[PDB]
Design an enzyme around this catalytic site. Structure first.
Site, PDB file in Angstrom:
ATOM      1  N   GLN A 152       3.032   1.092  -0.695  1.00 61.35           N
ATOM      2  CA  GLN A 152       2.938   2.279   0.161  1.00 61.35           C
ATOM      3  C   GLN A 152       2.193   2.031   1.470  1.00 61.35           C
ATOM      4  O   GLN A 152       2.314   2.843   2.396  1.00 61.35           O
ATOM      5  CB  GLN A 152       2.247   3.426  -0.585  1.00 61.35           C
ATOM      6  CG  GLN A 152       0.773   3.177  -0.888  1.00 61.35           C
ATOM      7  CD  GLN A 152       0.218   4.225  -1.827  1.00 61.35           C
ATOM      8  OE1 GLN A 152       0.394   4.136  -3.039  1.00 61.35           O
ATOM      9  NE2 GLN A 152      -0.397   5.252  -1.270  1.00 61.35           N
ATOM     10  N   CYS A 162       1.879   7.858  -2.194  1.00 66.43           N
ATOM     11  CA  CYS A 162       2.198   7.434  -3.543  1.00 66.43           C
ATOM     12  C   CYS A 162       3.045   8.447  -4.311  1.00 66.43           C
ATOM     13  O   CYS A 162       4.044   7.935  -5.069  1.00 66.43           O
ATOM     14  CB  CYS A 162       0.965   7.081  -4.379  1.00 66.43           C
ATOM     15  SG  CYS A 162      -0.357   8.243  -4.293  1.00 66.43           S
ATOM     16  N   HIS A 192      -3.725  10.701  -6.784  1.00 67.15           N
ATOM     17  CA  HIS A 192      -2.865   9.520  -6.745  1.00 67.15           C
ATOM     18  C   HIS A 192      -1.748   9.710  -7.760  1.00 67.15           C
ATOM     19  O   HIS A 192      -2.029   9.960  -8.935  1.00 67.15           O
ATOM     20  CB  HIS A 192      -3.681   8.256  -7.062  1.00 67.15           C
ATOM     21  CG  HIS A 192      -2.918   6.976  -6.887  1.00 67.15           C
ATOM     22  ND1 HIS A 192      -2.487   6.529  -5.654  1.00 67.15           N
ATOM     23  CD2 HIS A 192      -2.540   6.030  -7.779  1.00 67.15           C
ATOM     24  CE1 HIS A 192      -1.858   5.375  -5.797  1.00 67.15           C
ATOM     25  NE2 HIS A 192      -1.868   5.051  -7.077  1.00 67.15           N
TER      26      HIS A 192
END
Ligand SMILES: *[C@@H]1O[C@H](CO)[C@@H](O[C@@H]2O[C@H](CO)[C@@H](O[C@@H]3O[C@H](CO[C@H]4O[C@H](CO)[C@@H](O)[C@H](O)[C@@H]4O)[C@@H](O)[C@H](O[C@H]4O[C@H](CO)[C@@H](O)[C@H](O)[C@@H]4O)[C@@H]3O)[C@H](O)[C@H]2NC(C)=O)[C@H](O)[C@H]1NC(C)=O
Ligand SMILES: *[C@@H]1O[C@H](CO)[C@@H](O[C@@H]2O[C@H](CO)[C@@H](O)[C@H](O)[C@H]2NC(C)=O)[C@H](O)[C@H]1NC(C)=O
Length: 312
Positions: free
Chosen positions: A112, A118, A258
């Site tokens: 990424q 993400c 995340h």
């Protein structure tokens, strides 16, 4: 202020060349201090008794404050939901599952870059697997389309977003283009979606109930890799191998930061775990993957899981 030994210095010199870095004499000194501090944390951890090991990687000369600003979500997402639609059936389930082994069902590990996107790799990863499982065709879908275009579903490009919201975007947008026609840039750009170039499509979105980790087990066993989000903390950045766990991460939806992709699960020495694809490149962790303890809502991983049903 640490006294840095020559072993740490010589290794930092190699690390800088391996990671193509240049520092002024004055920033070099602060970077060396952070590197040495991480070096000792890694050794102190690995020299003790734990279910996972740490190692040096691309993050080793950064503080966690810097990592958080550059790589993780810059704001909490709307992970908490009072409604869901996935209803679990009945176990037991297989002792272990790994979609990477069942066939060509999991795409290669991607990177990424310096962008909190993400959630877009978790989304394309889940849909790539779904299409491959349904059709035998493995695609590579355009994360950059999600970065640039998915804002009407409360996603925020490099600042963060959510797989379930991104699946809905793909559904109502009538598809997602491939990496070949919409290449990844690692920054927020202009939306360049072309309808006639879409190659991946979503029919339904499955939202797993908050904290329903057993429904995640069932969904991975029976249907598809499962997108989820969790709270990354400083130790996780240096994860190398083994079963990750933490006593300092939170378990609540407002703290996750995340998004990743569960592609299987198993158990080692009595400790259940998840097999998870990350998006920090194939040299992070275990060839780009990590294991994280299962059955404890570890780091909030069961807070907002989701997967797509593809339109094929
Ligand atoms: C799983 O989790 C996800 C993520 O939180 C939830 O996602 C929401 O899903 C709903 C659908 O269930 C989405 O709502 C739909 O959005 C479509 C697009 O909206 C945009 O475009 C219209 C114009 O077309 C604008 O008016 C609007 O402001 C947006 O800019 C709409 O086309 C849909 O409308 C159709 O259905 C509705 C149903 O309410 C009717 O009222 C309409 O007349 C029309 O027939 C619909 O509004 C929503 O956008 C998603 N939110 C996010 C944040 O992604 C899922 O709902 C959840 N799943 C379950 C089962 O709970
Ligand atoms: C979480 O969801 C809420 C509600 O959908 C979002 O708040 C909306 O934000 C849009 C754009 O910023 C506004 O046009 C609406 O008026 C807001 N509605 C309400 C009720 O506040 C919020 O932006 C979402 N949060 C994140 C991080 O995506």
């Amino acid at each position: 202020e640490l006294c840095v030994n020559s072993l740490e210095k010589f290794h930092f010199k190699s690390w800088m060349s391996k990671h193509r870095k240049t520092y002024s004499t004055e920033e070099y000194h602060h970077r060396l201090q952070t590197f040495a501090s991480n070096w000792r944390k890694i050794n102190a951890h690995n020299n003790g008794n734990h279910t996972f090991k740490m190692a040096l990687n691309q993050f080793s000369d950064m503080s966690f404050a810097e990592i958080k600003h550059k790589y993780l979500w810059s704001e909490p997402q709307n992970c908490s939901a009072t409604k869901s639609n996935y209803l679990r059936g009945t176990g037991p389930y297989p002792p272990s599952v790994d979609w990477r082994k069942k066939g060509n069902f999991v795409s290669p590990v991607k990177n990424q870059g310096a962008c909190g996107s993400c959630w877009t790799f978790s989304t394309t990863g889940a849909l790539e697997s779904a299409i491959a499982i349904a059709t035998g065709k493995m695609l590579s879908l355009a994360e950059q389309q999600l970065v640039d275009c998915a804002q009407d579903f409360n996603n925020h490009g490099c600042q963060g977003g959510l797989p379930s919201q991104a699946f809905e975007y793909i559904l109502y947008n009538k598809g997602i283009m491939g990496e070949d026609t919409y290449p990844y840039q690692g920054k927020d750009g202009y939306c360049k979606f072309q309808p006639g170039k879409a190659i991946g499509f979503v029919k339904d979105v499955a939202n797993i109930t908050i904290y329903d980790e057993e429904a995640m087990v069932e969904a991975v066993a029976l249907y598809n890799p499962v997108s989820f989000a969790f709270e990354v903390t400083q130790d996780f950045m240096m994860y190398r191998t083994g079963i990750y766990s933490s006593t300092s991460c939170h378990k609540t939806p407002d703290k996750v930061n995340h998004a990743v992709l569960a592609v299987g699960y198993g158990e080692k020495n009595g400790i259940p775990y998840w097999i998870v694809k990350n998006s920090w490149g194939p040299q992070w962790g275990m060839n780009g993957y990590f294991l994280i303890e299962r059955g404890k809502n570890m780091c909030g991983l069961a807070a907002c899981a989701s997967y797509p049903i593809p339109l094929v």
